[PDB]
């Protein structure tokens, strides 16, 4: 369900909280699964602060729900990898 | 690949030298011996050595891993 | 004392799910390691 | 199978130490972290003994731990950056005695890698930012300010990842209310790799970069950069503002350069060496441990040199530049890993080996009997002020808590007469080395016995004001004895209860008139033996005594209880109100009266007609038995104790019935416990009341908060049970046997016998059965080398006057190891001392010395292979024993005759070899493994004749366990390789190979094909061989979190399960029990699955990460996590019981069964 392009930031996560839209709600932010969503998503930057306020960290809809890492990704601890909010390049 | 992964410790390719990989492995081993509390205690209580002297020896061995390069 | 069908006072149940009195549980624990239910492993439980 | 592993002994060596106002008040909490566990003490410093306020396990190793307080924050929050990326900042609340996590900042992947930040973590002095940095190329500064509710106003961290900039030491400088700064000793290691000849590697120099972080700009830039040619081993920062200059003192070899970021002078304070120091001058005096003890205005600096003497330093900077730091050796200090000097008589020095010292300040800290080396003090640029080992005049070490770390050798056996086996852990370095033999029994901290075996031993004190039992009346029918409860209980004639006749009860019930139930009746007995003995109800002796604060019901046969009521003078006078029970009262007790109550609400006596009669002890309602706790069997005692209250009748059979001790009659519920009569009375254990069902299985119905639960205790066997209160513990359960009292903590006595060198290998003689241990202090000056160097220094400095007398004083008395640090140097020099301590006495009955460059690698005193059953000891001494790099002369295997059946280490001869024979065992001949060469030689006293030598091993032979024509040997590469050593065929062929690469440092044969290995990374792996170049399958694997020194698959506890006892170098000892019960293993797995969700680990690395940090975990059950689930809260315990589909009391009973299964 992923793409070879569209890297997000690869920048270390801070206090700006991730946020999911309805069009891709419930999926994981990394492997897009639905099994035990464990860890809150932090998006490291002005990915939340400013123009993209309350927006999707995935495709681009109106962000309504807190984005979660799943327990399968936090088994290898992919939650510390950084910002998953997509910046188009 | 990724730019941050290239900036991360452990980036290597087929063009990476064996001596450079061994130097990076020795630097990572010195960093792991500095970080581990049990391994540093085992390295310090082996002889009549101080903890600050062992830390200075580890800081010297970090540069000594790149000390005699190719 | 379900076999005797007497009055019930200070109830206590053994480990083999046999409901009796407290003194009846003491008498069962002093008598046998098994209870009177199905001779299961009551282990002399004279407990409340 | 699955291994329900539980650590019986915690690790004693503190991996780190912090201190401050972490208790939220003026109580300076100091937390010593022993790795995965941290104990914080915030007790009274005037007590003199360390008392830990809290203990926390995080299931992870802290890469850098600190404790800092915010601006206005009275509670110092602890910030721990562990191996995992979750750096946990937690404010410690001492009301719950726990650290509530204000934040858990995520940084990166697990482990303290080269680029994983958090290896060096510090905070600003205003509590505004925290910097966590890696070894190199990674640094972060999180802006964590104070919120509106004084909460963690954390921010995203500014990154200071400078490429190949290794930070030797980083410290947050005190900038006050302005923009803070942090000074790091950055070293550009990129030029080292750029220069292929190493010219820039040699020309590289450190630079203290003080980077200032403008908080208004929210950006950190390198403000100051002071380069130093000498590398910074450690640095101590002078506190700026009103506490002194804003400078830092970078330490080097006899040079502490104090300088500030600005126009300040680089004051190079010389470290004051000892007057005629016997140590070599290669060991430069550097600040190994530094602590700035600050007053209201100024601050002194206590530093330890390479010798380690405590040197207090003043500061005559005069607020312009660093000028003078009067470093005078105030006291000689022992071998300490760290030292922190707080206020109000607190100075905690954590020892690497020996006893960690907590000190109380006596003088002002400048009381130096040695010379003073100021920074403004001139010298000849070759030495400093000759500050010899001074007396401890500045402060006195009020506590010396002995630590088992570094526990090198171990020998656990039940040879000594004790309630538990004595485990002798040989530990320590050089002359500061000892073997601590600990025997438990199960809190055997002190040994004390009552005088004889009297009828009753109760505190018939002088009055009610005598809280300590100055005269406990151990009164029998023949006579009476007075015992002092200070763990010095004996017999004396100061009881005063008139116990010449049979005194059944004797206790200070009145204000000064002790109630004594005796054959005369009820006696009011004073501090002296003035017993006004009123008659009881009837002419019989006092069988039962329900003694209260006002009315004591003395019950004779027939249940007739005369009420000795309190008169206006405080004496007990027998009133005319007496009531008879159903039968003869065996024993009685009265519940405690309230503050407004005139007497006891319920005094109950246990009659022989299976009942306990409880009456109101007030004079308006006396002799009226209302509550009837009807016993299920024939009652042997009664106990009517608070927590409404419970009145119980305990029987000779297995049922004790408790009802409500009140004016209303309760329901007599009969609970169960050894075929002995019960002696339920008032007892004290952990602040909760209990009624003792006296039996061979001594159970206690603990009535903690109106709920009586009866179970036994984990003490030694006995026949009766009572309370215990002495100098060892305030409240415990004394399982009273025949002239014996098994202690139950409802602690092991350790004696440390010293050794000459650092302990290497503890072995036992075959004939003597005595501990002929070998101690090897390698890479240091020996005893003979130290004596030769002292004589050489005497001959050198005798050439002069008073210098010859100083030379003789330097020869006679150098810096001692326990006083001012051991003077020792050299690389190939090595002390070897074989000390044969006796099987009972820790003193050495024999001493054997080796060469001054020879280290005793192994100790093996057993029967010789070439000779008969006589004990011939093979002692391997590696001459020129230098660790780094690989330098050794050769291994001399001295064959010793071991005279007096091993009690005299008489060396017969020696056999030399070029390599080091670290392993010497008997093999059907003797297998001696000299590195990769193992030879089967005859074990002769004169010389060895080798027959078959195999040099096909990979690296070395760490240790080989033989199970009969097969020996599994550990190596530096392979964890265990099994070679079928066919000594009948005179050959060795490797029947089993190894696939898992591990530097296994221990061996244990669980079966004929099971071999255990404790790797260098601290992982215990048990591998069973396959049935019938093939490896053995690792059946069990776990990571203990510390490097385990030794392991042995044996039943360590008395009876129980055949577990595996593992001893680590940090002082930890654990037992891994192979649980063959699959249902109990599944219940423990479900409890662990509930507990991993209910209780998260504080380090950020989980229990799975802690057990599988190096290699993956298998066949292990976490009894430590089971103990944490038992230590969880009440609502979390109810949720965990719902998750495990059971009860919390049932889970606690299962945990107690797992503890009793051993
Ligand atoms: Zn996922
Ligand atoms: Zn979306
Ligand atoms: Zn981002």
CA dist D1073 and D1151 (Å) reads 13
What tokens appear for D200 in the block? 């820039």
Mapped onto helix, strand or coil, the DSSP state of residue D209 is strand
Q: Nearest CA of chain B to the CA of A77: how many Å?
A: 16
Which CATH number is D442-751 given? Answer: 2.130.10.10
What tokens appear for D764 in the block? 């036992």
CA dist D881 and D1122 (Å) reads 45
Inter-chain CB proximity A77 and D85 less than 8 Å: yes
E runs forming strands in D414-547 = 422-429, 432-439, 456-459, 472-475, 480-483, 505-507, 514-518, 521-525, 531-534, 544-546
Mapped onto helix, strand or coil, the DSSP state of residue D830 is strand
Name residues whose C-beta falls within 8 Å of residue D189's C-beta, 6 or more positions apart in sequence. B62, B63, B66, D136, D164, D165, D166, D204
CA dist A75 and D1112 (Å) reads 13
Mapped onto helix, strand or coil, the DSSP state of residue D706 is coil
Alpha helices in C1-48 (DSSP H): 22-31
The ligand with the least distance to the CA atom of A20 is 2
CA dist D66 and D80 (Å) reads 6
Method: cryo-EM
**Contact exists between D and C (3 or more beta carbon pairs < 8 Å):** yes
Dihedrals phi, psi of D1082, to nearest 5 degrees? -70, -35
CA dist B69 and B3 (Å) reads 26
Pairing of strands D1044-1048, D338-341: unpaired
Q: Nearest CA of chain A to the CA of D85: how many Å?
A: 8
Best probe of the B interface among D58, D193, D282, by most B CBs < 10 A, is D193
The answer to whether D3-401 and D442-751 have equal CATH topology is yes
Alpha helices in B36-63 (DSSP H): 37-44, 51-63
Q: Check CB contact of B3 with chain A, cutoff 8 Å.
A: yes
What tokens appear for D1010 in the block? 């099971």
CA dist D591 and D546 (Å) reads 9
Instruction: Give which of D975, D761, D953 is closest to D875, Cα–Cα.
Output: D761
The DSSP letter of residue D497 is: S
Interface of D with A in 137-196 (CB under 8 A): 140, 154-157, 159
Could you tell me the distance, in angstroms and rounded to a whole number, from the CA of residue D109 to the centre of ligand 2? 27
Preceding amide of D406 cis, omega within 30: yes
D640 CB-side CA count, 13 A: 39
E runs forming strands in D347-465 = 347-350, 354-361, 372-373, 395-403, 407-413, 422-429, 432-439, 456-459
Cβ contacts (< 8 Å) between B70 and chain D: which residues? 196
Alpha helices in D1057-1141 (DSSP H): 1078-1094, 1103-1107, 1119-1126, 1130-1139
From the list D651, D654, D670, the residue facing C12 with the nearest CB is: D670
Partners of chain A (3+ Cβ pairs below 8 A)? B, D
CB atoms within 10 A of CB B58: 21
What tokens appear for D505 in the block? 């009860």
Could you tell me the distance, in angstroms and rounded to a whole number, from the CA of residue A65 to the centre of ligand 1? 16
3-state secondary structure D36-76: CEEEEECCCCCCCCCCCCEEEECCCCEEEEEEECCCCCCCC
3-state secondary structure D845-860: EEEEECCCECEEEECC
CA dist A86 and D128 (Å) reads 32
Could you tell me the distance, in angstroms and rounded to a whole number, from the CA of residue A50 to the centre of ligand 3? 12
- Whose structure tokens read 């104090």? D258
| Contact predicate D1150/D1083, CB 8 Å | yes
Cβ contacts (< 8 Å) between D16 and chain B: which residues? 37
Sign (positive or negative) of CA dihedral D154, D160, D161, D165: negative
CB atoms within 10 A of CB D860: 23
Instruction: Give which of D98, D241, D267, D229 is closest to D177, Cα–Cα.
Output: D241
CB atoms within 10 A of CB D197: 9
Instruction: Give which of D140, D214, D104, D64 is closest to A11, Cα–Cα.
Output: D140
From the list D630, D653, D668, the residue facing C30 with the nearest CB is: D653
CA dist D1012 and D999 (Å) reads 12
Sign (positive or negative) of CA dihedral A57, A58, A59, A63: negative
Instruction: Give which of D359, D256, D360, D353 is closest to D313, Cα–Cα.
Output: D256
CB atoms within 10 A of CB D1130: 8
Cβ contacts (< 8 Å) between B3 and chain A: which residues? 10
Dihedrals phi, psi of D141, to nearest 5 degrees? -130, 105
Longest dimension (CA), chain C: 26
Inter-chain CB proximity C29 and D670 less than 8 Å: no
CA dist D81 and D104 (Å) reads 10
| Contact predicate D630/D636, CB 8 Å | no
Mapped onto helix, strand or coil, the DSSP state of residue D356 is strand
Q: How many DSSP H helices and E strands does chain D contain? A: 9, 87
Between helix D783-797 and helix D802-812 the angle, nearest 10°, is: 180
Let me know the angle formed at the C-alpha of D262 by D258 and D263, rounded to the nearest 5 degrees: 85
Q: Write out the residue range of the structural domain in which residue B65 sits.
A: 5-69
Could you tell me the distance, in angstroms and rounded to a whole number, from the CA of residue A57 to the centre of ligand 3? 9
Name residues whose C-beta falls within 8 Å of residue D881's C-beta, 6 or more positions apart in sequence. D776, D778, D779, D828, D830, D853, D854, D855, D888
Could you tell me the distance, in angstroms and rounded to a whole number, from the CA of residue D1058 to the centre of ligand 1? 43
| Contact predicate D874/D889, CB 8 Å | no
C-alpha dist (Å) from residue D499 to D463, D465, D530, D587, D760: 17, 22, 11, 19, 58
Q: Check CB contact of D649 with chain C, cutoff 8 Å.
A: no
Best probe of the B interface among D82, D170, D192, by most B CBs < 10 A, is D192
CA dihedral D792, D797, D800, D804 (to 10 degrees): -90
Q: Nearest CA of chain B to the CA of D231: how many Å?
A: 8
Instruction: Please name every residue paired with D17 in a beta bridge, in sequence order, or none if there are none.
Output: D32
First and final C-alpha spacing in chain D = 16
Instruction: Give which of D288, D300, D211 is closest to D251, Cα–Cα.
Output: D288
CA dist D558 and D583 (Å) reads 5
Instruction: Give which of D1019, D1005, D1043, D959 is closest to D763, Cα–Cα.
Output: D959
The ligand with the least distance to the CA atom of A64 is 2
Name residues whose C-beta falls within 8 Å of residue A19's C-beta, 6 or more positions apart in sequence. A41, A43, A48, A54, A55, A56, A57, A63, A64, A65, A66, A67
CB atoms within 10 A of CB D1141: 9
DSSP state string for D541-578 = ---EEE--SSEEEEE-GGG-EEEEEE-TTS-EEEEEEE
Sign (positive or negative) of CA dihedral D417, D419, D421, D427: negative
- Whose structure tokens read 């450079």? B20
| Contact predicate B5/A7, CB 8 Å | no
CA dist D581 and D610 (Å) reads 11
Cβ contacts (< 8 Å) between D667 and chain C: which residues? 10
3-state secondary structure D864-890: CCCCCCCEEEEEEEEECCECCCCECCE
Query: Residues of chain A whose C-beta is under 8 A from some C-beta in D?
Result: 12-16, 42, 44, 77, 79-80
Q: Residue positions of A in the annotated binding site for Zn(2+)?
A: 9, 21, 24, 28, 31, 44, 47, 56, 59, 70, 73, 83
Instruction: Please name every residue paired with D68 in a beta bridge, in sequence order, or none if there are none.
Output: D77
| Contact predicate B50/B44, CB 8 Å | yes
Sign (positive or negative) of CA dihedral D544, D545, D551, D556: positive
| Contact predicate D512/D462, CB 8 Å | yes
CA dist D918 and D930 (Å) reads 6
CA dihedral D750, D756, D762, D764 (to 10 degrees): -90
CA dist D290 and D312 (Å) reads 10
D346-349: long-range pairs with CB below 8 Å, 24+: D346/D19, D346/D28, D346/D30, D346/D45, D347/D291, D347/D293, D347/D302, D347/D395, D348/D17, D348/D19, D348/D30, D348/D32, D348/D50, D349/D289, D349/D397
CB atoms within 10 A of CB D98: 15
User: How many domains, in total, are found in chain B?
Assistant: 1
Instruction: Give which of D1053, D1013, D973, D944 is closest to D412, Cα–Cα.
Output: D1053
First and final C-alpha spacing in chain B = 27
- Whose structure tokens read 């300590």? D468
**Contact exists between B and C (3 or more beta carbon pairs < 8 Å):** no
Cβ contacts (< 8 Å) between B69 and chain D: which residues? 192-193, 195-196, 198
CA dist D602 and D599 (Å) reads 9
Q: Check CB contact of B1 with chain A, cutoff 8 Å.
A: no
| Contact predicate D769/D838, CB 8 Å | no
Domain D3-401 has CATH 3.30.750.24: no
Could you tell me the distance, in angstroms and rounded to a whole number, from the CA of residue A89 to the centre of ligand 3? 14
Could you tell me the distance, in angstroms and rounded to a whole number, from the CA of residue D64 to the centre of ligand 3? 28
Could you tell me the distance, in angstroms and rounded to a whole number, from the CA of residue A24 to the centre of ligand 1? 13
DSSP state string for D1021-1055 = EEEEPPP---BPEEEEEEE-SS-EEEEE-S--SSS
Name residues whose C-beta falls within 8 Å of residue D133's C-beta, 6 or more positions apart in sequence. D117, D118, D119, D120, D121, D139, D140, D160, D167, D170, D184
Name residues whose C-beta falls within 8 Å of residue D149's C-beta, 6 or more positions apart in sequence. none
First and final C-alpha spacing in chain C = 15
């Amino acid at each position: 369900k992923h793409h070879p392009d569209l890297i997000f930031c690869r920048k270390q996560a801070g206090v700006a909280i991730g946020r999911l839209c309805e069009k891709c709600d419930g999926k994981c932010v990394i492997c897009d699964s639905y099994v035990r969503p464990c860890t809150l998503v932090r998006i490291c930057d002005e990915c939340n602060y400013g123009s993209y306020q309350g927006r999707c960290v995935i495709c681009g809809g109106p962000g309504v729900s807190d984005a979660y890492y799943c327990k399968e990704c936090t088994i290898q601890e992919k939650d510390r990898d950084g910002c998953p909010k997509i910046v188009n390049l | 690949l990724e730019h941050l992964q290239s900036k991360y410790i452990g980036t290597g390719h087929a063009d990476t030298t064996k001596w450079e990989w061994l130097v990076n492995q020795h630097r990572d081993s010195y960093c792991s011996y500095m970080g581990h509390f049990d391994l540093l205690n085992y390295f310090a209580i082996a002889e009549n050595e101080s903890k600050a002297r062992v830390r200075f020896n580890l800081m010297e061995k970090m540069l000594q891993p790149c000390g005699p390069p190719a | 004392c379900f076999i005797c069908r007497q009055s019930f006072q200070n109830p206590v149940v053994t480990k083999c799910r046999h409901y009796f009195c407290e003194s009846c549980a003491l008498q069962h624990f002093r008598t046998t390691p098994r209870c009177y239910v199905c001779d299961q492993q009551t282990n002399g439980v004279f407990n409340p | 199978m699955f291994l329900y592993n539980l650590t019986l002994q915690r690790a004693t060596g503190i991996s780190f130490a912090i201190h401050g106002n972490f208790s939220g008040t003026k109580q300076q909490e100091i937390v010593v972290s022993r790795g995965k566990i941290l104990e914080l003490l915030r007790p009274d410093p005037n007590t003199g003994k360390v008392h830990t306020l809290l203990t926390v396990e995080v299931f992870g190793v802290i890469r850098s731990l600190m404790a800092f307080r915010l601006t206005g924050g009275t509670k110092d929050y602890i910030v721990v950056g562990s191996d995992s990326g979750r750096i946990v900042i937690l404010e410690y609340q001492p009301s719950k005695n726990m650290f509530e996590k204000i934040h858990q900042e995520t940084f990166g992947k697990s482990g303290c890698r080269r680029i994983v930040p958090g290896q060096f973590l510090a905070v600003d002095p205003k509590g505004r930012a925290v910097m966590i940095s890696a070894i190199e190329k990674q640094k972060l500064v999180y802006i964590l300010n104070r919120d509106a509710a004084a909460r963690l106003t954390i921010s995203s961290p500014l990154e200071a990842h400078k490429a190949n900039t290794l930070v030797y030491h980083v410290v947050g400088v005190d900038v006050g209310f302005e923009n803070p700064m942090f000074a790091c000793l950055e070293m550009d290691y990129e030029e080292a790799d750029n220069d292929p000849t190493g010219e820039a590697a040699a020309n590289t120099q450190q630079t203290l970069t003080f980077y200032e972080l403008d908080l208004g700009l929210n950006h950190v830039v390198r403000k100051y950069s002071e380069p130093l040619e000498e590398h910074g081993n450690f640095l101590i920062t002078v506190p700026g503002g009103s506490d002194g200059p804003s400078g830092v003192l970078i330490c080097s070899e006899n040079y502490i350069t104090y300088k500030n970021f600005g126009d300040q002078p680089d004051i190079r304070c010389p470290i004051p060496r000892r007057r005629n120091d016997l140590d070599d001058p290669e060991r430069g005096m550097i600040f190994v441990c530094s602590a700035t003890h600050k007053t209201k205005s100024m601050f002194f600096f206590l530093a330890q040199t390479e010798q380690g003497d405590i040197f207090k330093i003043t500061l005559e900077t005069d607020e312009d530049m660093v000028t003078e730091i009067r470093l005078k050796y105030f006291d000689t200090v022992p071998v300490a890993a760290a030292m922190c000097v707080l206020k109000t008589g607190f100075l905690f020095v954590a020892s690497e080996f020996g006893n960690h010292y907590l000190y109380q300040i006596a003088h002002l800290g400048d009381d130096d009997e040695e010379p003073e080396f100021s920074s403004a003090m001139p010298l000849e640029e070759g030495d400093t002020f000759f500050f010899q080992p001074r007396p401890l005049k500045n402060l006195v070490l009020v506590d010396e808590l002995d630590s088992l770390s570094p526990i090198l050798f171990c020998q656990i056996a039940d040879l000594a007469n004790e309630d538990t086996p004595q485990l002798y852990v040989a530990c320590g370095r050089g002359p500061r080395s000892s073997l601590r033999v600990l025997r438990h029994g199960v809190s055997e901290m002190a040994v004390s016995e009552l005088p004889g075996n009297p009828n009753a031993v109760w505190t018939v004190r002088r009055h009610i004001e005598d809280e300590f039992d100055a005269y406990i009346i151990v009164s029998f029918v023949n006579a009476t004895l007075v015992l002092s409860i200070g763990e010095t209980v004996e017999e004396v004639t100061d009881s005063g209860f008139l116990g010449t006749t049979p005194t059944l009860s004797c206790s200070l019930l009145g204000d000064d008139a002790l109630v004594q139930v005796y054959p005369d009746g009820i006696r009011h007995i004073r501090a002296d033996k003035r017993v006004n003995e009123w008659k009881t109800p009837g002419k019989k002796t006092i069988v039962k005594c329900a003694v209260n604060q006002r009315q004591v019901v003395i019950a004779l046969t027939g249940g007739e209880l005369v009420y000795f009521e309190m008169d206006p003078s405080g004496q007990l006078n027998e009133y005319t109100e007496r009531k008879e029970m159903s039968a003869d009262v065996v024993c009685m007790s009265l519940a405690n009266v309230p503050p407004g109550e005139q007497r006891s609400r319920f005094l109950a006596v246990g009659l022989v007609d299976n009942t306990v009669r409880i009456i109101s002890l007030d004079p308006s309602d006396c002799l009226q038995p209302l509550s009837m706790q009807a016993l299920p069997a024939q009652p042997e005692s009664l106990c009517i104790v608070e927590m409404f209250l419970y009145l119980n009748i305990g029987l000779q059979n297995g049922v004790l019935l408790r009802t409500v001790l009140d004016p209303v009659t309760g329901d007599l519920s009969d609970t169960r416990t050894g075929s002995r009569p019960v002696k339920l009375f008032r007892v004290r254990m952990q602040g909760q009341e209990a009624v003792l069902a006296m039996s061979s299985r001594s159970w206690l119905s603990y009535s903690y908060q109106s709920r009586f639960h009866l179970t036994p205790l984990s003490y030694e066997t006995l026949e009766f049970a009572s309370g215990f209160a002495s100098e060892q513990c305030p409240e415990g359960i004394v399982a009273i046997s025949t002239n014996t009292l098994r202690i139950l903590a409802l602690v092991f006595n350790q004696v440390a016998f010293p050794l000459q060198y650092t302990p290497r290998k503890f072995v036992i003689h075959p004939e003597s059965n005595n501990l002929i241990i070998i101690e090897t202090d390698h890479n240091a000056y020996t005893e003979a080398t130290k004596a030769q160097r002292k004589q050489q220094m005497a001959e050198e400095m005798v050439e002069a006057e008073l210098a010859a007398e100083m030379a003789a004083a330097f020869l006679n008395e150098n810096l001692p190891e326990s006083i001012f640090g051991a003077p020792k140097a050299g690389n190939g020099q090595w002390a070897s001392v074989i000390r044969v301590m006796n099987p009972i006495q820790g003193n050495t009955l024999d001493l054997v010395q080796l060469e001054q460059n020879e280290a005793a690698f192994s100790v093996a005193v057993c029967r010789f292979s070439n000779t008969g059953e006589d004990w011939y000891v093979l002692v391997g001494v590696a001459k020129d024993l230098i660790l780094n790099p690989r330098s050794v002369a050769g291994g001399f295997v001295y064959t010793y005759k071991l005279v007096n059946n091993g009690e005299k280490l008489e060396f017969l001869h020696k056999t030399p070899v070029e390599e080091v024979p670290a392993a010497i065992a008997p093999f059907q001949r003797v297998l001696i493994g000299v590195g990769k060469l193992l030879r089967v030689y005859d074990l002769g006293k004169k010389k060895l004749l080798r027959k078959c030598e195999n040099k096909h091993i990979a690296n070395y032979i760490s240790g080989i366990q033989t199970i009969g024509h097969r020996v599994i040997v550990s190596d530096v590469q392979e964890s265990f390789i099994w070679v079928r050593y066919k000594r009948n065929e005179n050959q060795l062929i490797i029947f089993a190979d190894d696939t898992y690469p591990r530097w296994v440092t221990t061996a244990s044969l669980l079966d004929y094909d099971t071999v255990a290995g404790a790797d260098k990374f601290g992982n215990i792996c048990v591998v069973r061989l396959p049935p019938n170049s093939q490896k053995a399958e690792v059946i069990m694997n776990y990571h203990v979190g510390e490097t385990v020194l030794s392991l042995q698959k044996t039943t360590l506890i008395p009876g129980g399960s055949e577990s595996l006892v593992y001893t680590t170098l940090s002082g930890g000892i654990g037992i891994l029990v192979p649980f063959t019960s699959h249902e109990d293993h599944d219940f423990f797995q479900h409890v662990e699955m509930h507990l991993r969700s209910e209780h998260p680990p504080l380090c950020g690395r989980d229990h799975l990460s802690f057990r599988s940090y190096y290699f993956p975990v298998k066949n292990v059950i976490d009894g430590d996590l089971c103990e944490q689930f038992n230590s969880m809260e009440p609502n979390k315990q109810k949720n965990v019981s719902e998750e495990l589909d059971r009860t919390p009391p049932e889970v606690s009973k299962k945990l107690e069964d797992i503890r009793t299964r051993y």
